[PDB]
Design a protein around this nucleic acid. Structure first.
Ligand SMILES: Nc1ncnc2c1ncn2[C@@H]1O[C@@H]2COP(=O)(O)O[C@H]2[C@H]1O
Ligand SMILES: Nc1ncnc2c1ncn2[C@@H]1O[C@@H]2COP(=O)(O)O[C@H]2[C@H]1O
Lengths: 197, 197
DNA sequence: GCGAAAAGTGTGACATAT
DNA sequence: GTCACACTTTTCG
DNA sequence: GCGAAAAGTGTGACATAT
DNA sequence: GTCACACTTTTCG
């Protein structure tokens, strides 16, 4: 509703899966809102693998870290998980629309507050938990991340050892090793699709 | 500014060094604004180890992350590093001030945005950089934080091996072990306080 | 809902940073 | 990373 | 700006997780 | 955590 008004100033572009919709290092001018799809925010090692900072789904804004100060660079990469419809407005336009109705600025700040909250958790987990525990937290969370199919006894997620590695911070084969251990303990069942039972 | 209008309906309180303002887990109901002094935002593991998420200094809001969603716990501990003159507003009342003037909700959300920006970076260092690199980036950044004294040529910061330990995520012992490595390498000069070249 | 081309994976011996 | 310990440093009354 | 208690520390041989 | 390669599994035209 306030959303529809917002969306009316926006221009929906379509992006297929694997699209890198934002890239770290360019300048920020556009605030993006996910009409449809799921996206993955990433940062890349100083000459190497990348780590996934979070999945953002329909209803999230992307880009915003620029919005508040001029000449701001994009902080991370945002690649499409799935095919997405991205409603954009520019920042200038967003500012006018701020003054016209504060409620987008509120729902966006709410989003900002959550990302900080969960990323503070991620600093915590990177510092206090061992890889096994990180992989446990992650399957727990992924069964909660809105795209796990119900499993009569369990929740089923499609995920690759490589993706879990990139979330966690360890080799795809390290992930492998541990997923084998959690299967032997009758906690997890897997084959490209894993069930967090 | 907008600032003074805000502050007039805040109960200004004074915290001594080491006083714990926020305990993580408390119910969020009050936003704070640091009028004078410095605070450290930290999280601890159930078996005792604690990590500093950031030092917040005057001019920063403390306790923002509950303002947006009804009934949340405080996300981290905020302990006063120094004598702090801290302003306090009821959440319900701050809500009112936003409707009355959006520029404070703007100044605030800006602060949370820069915070999302630095906390994603701290996730990045933990995941990507070994302790030497992490302590390196630390000595560097501390030498830009407002309290770094100059030491003719070079910066001078006073920070115990303890603290850096809590910033980087390794034992005070290891912090020592590597600071000397950085002394042999001619980059750090140390004796209780450090002069980062 | 095919089937070729692509993508993800397990293995075991090893070092190695905190 | 850990351990215990005496050792060095800094704090301030 | 003196000194005594508090706060910080280095050692060294070590175990271990990814 | 590493290396590589054979194998298995998923993608997509
Ligand atoms: N830690 C994070 N958690 C969630 N989203 C993030 C995080 N860091 C960056 N982003 C989002 O990804 C975007 C990357 O560049 P921007 O600065 O445009 O704005 C960023 C946010 O929209
Ligand atoms: N990553 C962070 N950087 C800075 N401050 C933080 C961070 N995480 C939490 N905080 C602050 O610590 C406060 C804890 O309580 P709140 O969740 O109300 O609000 C939180 C923020 O003000």
């Amino acid at each position: 509703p306030t959303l529809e008004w917002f969306l009316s100033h926006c221009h929906i572009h379509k992006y297929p899966s694997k699209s890198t919709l934002i890239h770290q290092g360019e300048k920020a001018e556009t605030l993006y809102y996910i009409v449809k799809g799921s996206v993955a925010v990433l940062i890349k090692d100083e000459e190497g693998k990348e780590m996934i900072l979070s999945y953002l789904n329909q209803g999230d804004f992307i880009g915003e870290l620029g919005l508040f100060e001029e000449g701001q660079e994009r902080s991370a990469w945002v690649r499409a998980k799935t095919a997405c419809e991205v409603a954009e407005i520019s920042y200038k336009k967003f500012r006018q629309l701020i003054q016209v109705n504060p409620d987008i600025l509120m729902r966006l700040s709410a989003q900002m507050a959550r990302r900080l909250q969960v990323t503070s958790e991620k600093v915590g987990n990177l510092a206090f938990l061992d890889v096994t525990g990180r992989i446990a937290q992650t399957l727990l969370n992924l069964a909660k991340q809105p795209d796990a199919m119900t499993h009569p006894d369990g929740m089923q997620i499609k995920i690759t050892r490589q993706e879990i590695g990139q979330i966690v911070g360890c080799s795809r084969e390290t992930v492998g090793r541990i997923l084998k251990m959690l299967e032997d303990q009758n906690l997890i069942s897997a084959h490209g699709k894993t069930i967090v039972v």
